[PDB]
Structure formats: C-alpha cells, structure tokens
Amino acid sequence: KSELAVEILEKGQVRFWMQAEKLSGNAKVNYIFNEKEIFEGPKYKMHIDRNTGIIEMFMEKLQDEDEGTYTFQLQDGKATNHSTVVLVGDVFKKLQKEAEFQRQEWIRK
Helix, strand or coil, X not given: CEEEEEEECCCCCEEEEEECCCCCCXXXXXXXXXXXXXXXXXXXXXXXXXXXXXXXXXXXXXXXXXXXXXXXXXXXXXXXXXXXXXXXXXXXXXXXXXXXXXXXXXXXX
C-alpha cells in the first residue's frame, strides 16, 4: 500500500495515486480538492483498479487554481481510508513548473 502521492507524467499530466491492499467491488473513492468533492469531467479523470488497489486521479495540467489539498477518501463498506497531498506554496509551484516543462516539451518534441 502507498498513501496519496502526486507525480507528473511524460506529457505533463498529473497523477495522484495511492495503493489500497485490496478493493472490493463496493470500494468507493471521494476525490477531494480543497475540501470540495471533485468528479470525473473536463478536468479530472479517476480510475480505481480493485485488483491492484491502485486508485489514481489524473489532470491534464496544473493551473494556478489547482493549488491546494488533494484527498482520496477511500470507503470499502465500513473500511475508510483518507490520504492527502498538500500541494501548496513552493511544493505546488515546483510541481507546476515540472508539469509545465513536460507539457511544453511534449508539444515541442
């Protein structure tokens, strides 16, 4: 298992992911950004692999507005895990610079 982590992918896409030990078909994840539930949509893509326990949310990019706290609220029935990455201040700027560089370099190359 691994708590919530963020990384930037080759195109500068953002990957939030954590690993549960096992997920039942009933496992559910509340994706939380600055204490607001966020949903699969124009901005986020969510995936749960119930086999691997890998829960991951993807963004295309990190806008200034994306600074904040990201939480995955995992519920498997009674079972209840939250994991949080605080992408604020310098942490956010650095991650954003990386994501912007990779997004820029993808389009450049």
